[PDB]
């Protein structure tokens, strides 16, 4: 009824410990969601074309051209680690767990409140808020996954991360097909390159409507909506990282000399002349058996063209890479292609007392050593005469195509049947949790945005919309906008996310890396004297595991 | 209760496939309906007489004289194709099906909201909207078809075609009896032709009221009304067209000289002199057996007097024709009598963002070839002397009654026992779906407005009305209009229309016509940058079928 | 999820576009470029890569001689202009048993190039490589364009 509650607030985390070292992590998240009525009740096909920014030669990477359908519906997205776990929960998980499974997900909407706003004619403005007990909130769950998948973590538009702060749903939109061409250039290119928006291919048009595709529930103040429990079918996610590159695979060489006194410069020596050694190499025209030249089982990682931009029907885009840079852990300034950079607002980690439109940003440097250090690569002639001469070697300091700033490693790909690589680590709190698999016939081996990828399906998207609240002057044949009472809704959202994790075992004599509080990061986890909060980022794959 | 929803919004279309190539098409439509309190609570008997327009000689076809009963009720009519199908569903139906059956219809009203309007006495006007929880909406279902049948598609007054656009019902009115005489004339006619409204014949007076004939349900904010499933008894509707005229029935003549080379002018020849041929003709006094004179089983189509106006007690009206014109499919400018013209507004297809009172119009050119090419006909004397002389042939070029613009084909009827014709095709989105059969002893073979005609009876009309909300100063003895609290209602209408259709089969080597999205019509099916929408007319009988 | 448009058009026409509104270095989102603040449609992270670039009209040799390197996807812009159909678009040559007009004389086969509706190809004239630093606007020495020998 009007005065009866339809649900309970729960933002607790439960750790039920099953048999055989497994734990059943249940994460409950409850939010107060504020929803305003849409700016228009209509679907808009809008086209963006920043020809002013791209008309500057050399700015082709700043292209924003696209077409999208703008919908009156809003999306309630909880696909971010911060919606479920606070820093203590994350510390427990990443310090005590070895692997993580995604089990089930359910959500519900309860305690719906719809209000109206009326402004007086008094010369000094004043306005009052009234309940509309008969107003309804439209709710649609796309359980069949008919609508385009639009995960909000990409735009930092999921639900907030604080149980005690109200949150909002992101207005919903999806990409409408367009054709675009942009010929790249540089500062000093003669003429204006081709920079044209071509229009839309009729064979690719897809105008989706929530009304025509999803059942819609009308909720009054006494109604509730529950989705039911969806069960995932994803692969396990590892909370451990690999440090072994190809140089650390297999039996090391026997040291026929070992140091007799401890010290930095007291090295051990193999003691066998290099071309007189025993072992296996994949180089049939040399007798040198060295650490660089000895055969290894396979490859760990792969070189890829970095900051390579590829063009298709819709315009340029960056070629994605599955691993981060080498040497970035030692020097953060060297973090580059492959190290994901997140920008976010005050709902999602930025100090809440800060003023200004500038977001908080961090580049996520992962602990796994699967990257490449391109400054250390080189090609050389098949003859393999050592020491190598200038004409028989290609170094990263060597111009490709006549350019002093482009070398061979920029256009270099070594992905092959021998490549081994890991899935992307989880990123707390701004990282996406699960992603839908592409509907291509042949599927990618991994996703760069989520550690969990859904094979068959995973949960439909939850859309909300304040139902139209018309005045007495409505005329559907009028060309002007709809006359509506200023109406908005506040409703409570509760979700349950279930994980299954495996407790870790100490395999080594030494202790491992763990997340801890210290004097430096002490005040990143508590409120300020004026109530400000922040959620800094945390690394996930702390513990090391042996690759081979 | 006040805060509990009484129904769910559903506007999906389901295609459940059955055995033997039959599909159970379930179309769901849900609207938000805006209803105002009527201008008056009283029934009116109103006479319209545009003597000014018909006083000009030659304007008799512009007669608008009639008498109607203006009721305070409003009609919730969903009897148009666009209320149930969007362009994609229509494409699927018309491209993959051969015949359509109308099965069942049901509708329900839920989530009733009644609001009142109050205007402040402040010098700058302002007004507020309040909920009247005790107010009622009067709902009447005429399940016994006691009231006159007044389908709204004929006036373009059905529910809107867009699920996301609130719609309105049409104020209900029905014809009263009147006697009218209007003697036709032309510019230059001497004197004033008789143009007189005669009154009402008492033997034909029929004054229907909803209250004395139909149960009325008083719905408060927490109430819902459901009609119950109705089941039709109509004939199947064909989604194929016939191209065979009389000239294309039977066995073509044997060609004794087949062409020896490709080309447009490389024709074949029968090779037998026309007066020495074998076959059957109904011309017992001539030896010529020619394609025009050879016997055929029956007649496909018929000639009717076109732009003929017939006068009965109530005044002139156009004589309808079951088939369209000939040659109109090659030249749209030749579309005339028989090709329906639909004039509609922004609720029913006209681009919603356009201003002005001008309606959107289209003339439907059916794919069927059952029409006539009146300028290709002629009549000649029974003797059949060829080549025919002037005095023995009546041509469309020749005058009738001394008129240079009227020829014998204007007064010509060739309907007979040998006439074969087709039913009217569905017209999307603006066409009627079903119509009621006339209560005459002898009934028409087809209706020219709806492909489905209801043999016994079919669903009762749904009437809605805001119950009077009186002030404290009501006095039934006063002659002035009742003083009411300005009240309007918004309620949700959901309807389910079920069809049965048969999947088509390929019977020919060549492919057939299909409706498709192309670069020309691409933007008729997607919204504009400011939300504009339109629904364009689509043909229905795309595939051909052999008549004989 | 496309970017939220803070400015929407108020009239219909070819010059009425929508605007994101947020300055490019002030935007929120995820990029795979740890050394820049620019979140743009060409730089924002995507789940994976649709299609791939392959060496086109590449001939490789083995024991039996040279053969073309096959490719799984067609070209970009082939649908827009059929004269651009190239590597990746299968070209079929056939005679009068298998489709060629049967009444035509001569030994010339009937041919067509198949342009698929799937958009998984590439527009190599639109690709470019630029130095990791990513200083914009890019200068000549720090970009490798398809126009470069």
């Amino acid at each position, epitope marked *: 009824g009007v005065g009866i509650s339809t649900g309970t607030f729960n933002n607790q985390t439960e750790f039920k410990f099953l048999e055989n070292g497994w734990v059943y992590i249940t994460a409950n998240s409850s939010r107060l969601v504020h929803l305003n009525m849409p700016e228009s009740e209509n679907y808009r096909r809008v086209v963006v074309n920043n020809l002013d920014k791209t008309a500057v030669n050399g700015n082709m990477a700043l292209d924003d051209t696209h077409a999208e359908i703008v919908t009156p519906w809003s999306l309630v997205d909880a696909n971010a680690w911060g919606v479920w776990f606070n820093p203590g929960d994350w510390q427990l998980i990443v310090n005590t767990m070895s692997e993580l499974h995604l089990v089930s997900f359910e959500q519900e909407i309860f305690n719906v409140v719809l209000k109206t706003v009326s402004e007086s004619a008094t010369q000094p403005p004043t306005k009052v808020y009234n309940n509309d007990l008969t107003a309804s909130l439209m709710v649609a769950l796309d359980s069949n996954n008919t609508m385009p998948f639009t995960p909000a973590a990409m735009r930092s538009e999921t639900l907030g991360f604080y149980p005690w702060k109200p949150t909002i749903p992101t207005p919903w939109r999806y990409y409408f097909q367009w054709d675009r061409t942009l010929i790249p250039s540089h500062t000093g290119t003669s003429g204006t390159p081709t*920079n*044209i928006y071509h*229009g839309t291919d009729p064979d690719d048009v897809q105008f989706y409507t929530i009304e025509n595709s999803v059942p819609v529930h009308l909720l009054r103040t006494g109604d509730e909506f529950a989705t039911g429990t969806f069960f995932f079918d994803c692969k396990p996610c590892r909370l451990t990282h690999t440090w072994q590159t190809n140089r650390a695979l297999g039996l090391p060489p026997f040291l026929n000399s070992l140091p007799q006194s401890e010290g930095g410069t007291n090295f051990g020596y193999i003691g066998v002349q290099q071309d007189k050694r025993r072992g296996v190499t994949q180089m049939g025209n040399t007798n040198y058996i060295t650490e660089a030249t000895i055969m290894r089982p396979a490859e760990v990682g792969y070189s890829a063209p970095y900051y390579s931009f590829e063009a298709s029907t819709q315009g340029p885009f960056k070629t994605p890479i599955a691993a981060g840079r080498g040497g970035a852990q030692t020097d953060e300034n060297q973090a580059a292609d492959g190290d994901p950079r997140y920008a976010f607002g005050r709902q999602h980690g930025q100090k809440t007392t800060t003023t200004g439109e500038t977001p908080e940003r961090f580049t996520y440097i992962a602990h796994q050593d699967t990257g490449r250090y391109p400054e250390g690569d080189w090609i050389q002639n098949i003859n393999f005469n050592l020491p190598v001469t200038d004409d028989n070697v290609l170094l990263p300091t060597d111009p490709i195509g006549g350019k002093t700033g482009i070398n061979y490693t920029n256009i270099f790909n070594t992905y092959g049947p021998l490549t081994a690589l890991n899935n992307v680590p989880p990123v707390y709190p701004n990282g996406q949790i699960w992603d839908k698999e592409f509907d291509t016939d042949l599927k990618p081996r991994l996703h760069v945005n989520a550690p969990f990828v859904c094979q068959n399906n995973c949960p439909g998207q939850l859309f909300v919309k304040v139902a139209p609240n018309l005045t007495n002057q409505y005329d559907p044949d009028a060309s002007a906008n709809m006359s509506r009472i200023v109406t908005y809704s506040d409703f409570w959202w509760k979700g349950k996310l279930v994980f299954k994790a495996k407790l870790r075992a100490s395999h080594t004599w030494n202790p491992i890396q763990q997340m801890s509080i210290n004097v430096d990061n002490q005040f990143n986890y508590v409120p300020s004297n004026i109530g400000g909060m922040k959620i800094v980022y945390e690394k996930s794959q702390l513990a090391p595991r042996k690759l081979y | 209760g006040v805060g509990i929803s009484t129904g769910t919004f559903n506007n999906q279309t389901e295609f459940k496939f059955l055995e033997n190539g039959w599909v159970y098409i379930t179309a769901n439509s849900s609207r938000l309906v805006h209803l105002n309190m009527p201008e008056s609570e009283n029934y009116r008997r109103v006479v319209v007489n545009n003597l000014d327009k018909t006083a000009v000689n030659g304007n008799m076809a512009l007669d608008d004289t009639h008498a109607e009963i203006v009721t305070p009720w409003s009609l919730v009519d969903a009897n148009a194709w666009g209320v149930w199908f969007n362009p994609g569903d229509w494409q699927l139906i018309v491209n993959t099906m051969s015949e359509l059956h109308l099965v069942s219809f049901e509708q329900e009203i839920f989530n009733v909201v009644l609001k009142t309007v109050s205007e402040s006495a402040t010098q700058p006007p302002t007004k507020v909207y309040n909920n009247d929880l005790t107010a009622s909406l009067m709902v009447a279902l005429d399940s016994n078809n006691t009231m006159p049948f007044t389908p709204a598609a004929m006036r373009s007054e059905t529910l809107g075609f867009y699920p996301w656009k609130p719609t309105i019902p049409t104020p209900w009115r029905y014809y009263f009896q009147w006697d009218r005489t209007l003697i036709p004339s032309h510019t230059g006619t001497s004197g004033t032709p008789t143009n007189i409204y005669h009154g009402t014949d008492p033997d034909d007076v029929q004054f229907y009221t909803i209250e004395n004939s139909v149960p009325v349900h008083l719905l408060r904010t927490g109430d819902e009304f459901a009609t119950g499933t109705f089941f039709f008894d109509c004939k199947p509707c064909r989604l194929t067209h016939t191209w065979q005229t009389n000239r294309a029935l039977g066995l073509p003549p044997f060609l004794n000289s087949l062409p020896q080379s490709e080309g447009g002018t490389n024709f074949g020849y029968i090779g037998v002199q026309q007066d020495k041929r074998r076959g059957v003709t109904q011309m017992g006094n001539t030896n010529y057996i020619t394609e025009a004179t050879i016997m055929r089983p029956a007649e496909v189509g018929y000639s009717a007097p076109y732009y003929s106006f017939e006068a009965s007690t109530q005044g002139p009206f156009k004589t309808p024709i079951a088939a369209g014109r000939g040659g109109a499919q090659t030249d749209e400018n030749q579309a005339a009598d028989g090709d329906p013209r639909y004039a509609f507004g922004r609720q029913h297809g006209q681009k919603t963002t356009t201003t002005g009172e001008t309606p959107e119009r289209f003339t439907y050119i059916a794919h069927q070839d059952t029409g006539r090419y009146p300028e290709g006909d002629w009549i000649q004397n029974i003797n059949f002397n060829l080549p025919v002389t002037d005095d023995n042939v009546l041509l469309p070029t020749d005058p009738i009654g001394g008129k240079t613009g009227i020829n014998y084909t204007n007064i010509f009827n060739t309907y007979g026992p040998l006439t074969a014709l087709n039913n009217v095709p569905p017209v999307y989105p603006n066409g009627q779906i079903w119509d009621k059969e006339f209560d005459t002893d002898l009934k028409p073979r087809l209706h020219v407005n709806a492909p489905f005609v209801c043999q016994n009876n079919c669903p009762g009309q749904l009437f809605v009305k805001v119950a009077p909300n009186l002030t404290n100063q009501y006095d039934p003895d006063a002659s002035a209009n009742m003083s009411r609290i300005v009240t309007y209602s918004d309620f949700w209408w959901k309807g389910k229309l079920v069809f049965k259709a048969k999947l088509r089969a390929s019977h020919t080597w060549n492919p057939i016509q299909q409706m498709s999205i192309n670069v020309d019509n691409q933007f008729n099916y997607v919204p504009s940058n400011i939300g504009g929408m339109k629904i364009v007319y689509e043909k229905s009988q795309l595939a051909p079928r052999k008549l004989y | 999820l496309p970017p939220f448009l803070n400015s929407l058009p108020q009239s219909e026409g*070819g*010059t009425n576009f929508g605007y994101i509104g947020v300055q490019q270095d002030k935007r929120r989102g995820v990029t795979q470029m740890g050394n820049t603040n620019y979140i743009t449609e060409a730089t924002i992270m995507r789940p994976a890569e649709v299609g791939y670039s392959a060496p086109y009209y590449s001939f490789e040799a083995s024991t039996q001689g040279p053969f073309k390197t096959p490719i799984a996807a067609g070209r970009g812009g082939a649908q*827009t*202009d059929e004269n651009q159909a190239a590597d990746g678009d299968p070209r079929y040559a056939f005679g009068r048993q298998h489709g060629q007009k049967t009444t035509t004389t001569g030994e010339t086969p009937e041919r067509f190039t198949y342009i698929a509706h799937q958009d998984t190809g590439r527009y190599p004239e639109g690709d470019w490589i630029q130095n990791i630093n990513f200083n914009l606007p890019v200068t000549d020495d720090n970009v490798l364009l398809p126009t470069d020998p």
Partner: antibody
Amino acid sequence: EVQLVESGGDLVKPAGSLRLSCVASGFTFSSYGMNWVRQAPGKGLQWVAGVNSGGFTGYADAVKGRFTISRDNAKNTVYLQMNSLTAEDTAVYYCAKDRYYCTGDYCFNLIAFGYWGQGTLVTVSS
Amino acid sequence: SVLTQPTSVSGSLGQRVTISCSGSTNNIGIVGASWYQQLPGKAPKLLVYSDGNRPSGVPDRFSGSNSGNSATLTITGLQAEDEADYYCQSVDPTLGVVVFGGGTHLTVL
């Protein structure tokens, strides 16, 4: 090779109306826009109007309130309708094709005529 | 919006010729000019695109460049084939209006 042919030239009164037509061939007609450019005697080229695949049109400020342009992709034909003509409209009108593929509402951001017809003469006088 | 061109330009056989077209940030500063050739009484012919490319069969003699709000057409190795009239064409994206220049007559000495 691409080829265009125009027609419709005539002499009309200082306040009449006229209609012109071009026929095209040799390319994907629906993919490229077609434009009307005129040249007064002894003067330079002047743009009149252009129409794209979906029927969207653009008119110069000199003719925006008077003229109308249309297509028929099933017939590879482009028409121009002129109303309320004045003496200044006298010129030879040339029918041309765009180098760039644009179809819908958002054209006229990059135009470059790559093929041309033969031209037709329009004379406005008493 | 209108573009500006010099009335005439003169060059001698074998020399270099330059023709200049001036516009604004609204027309040439976003979409560069495209250059056309017109023999007396004949239909125009496109010479150089806005990006410096030429239609198939146009000699490399013809070249173009864009700087700020001004564009230029350069004809190298002037031959007797080049005596004609030349025009600059640009489109205004703000208004959606195609803009031609006034035209320049080329004299070969």
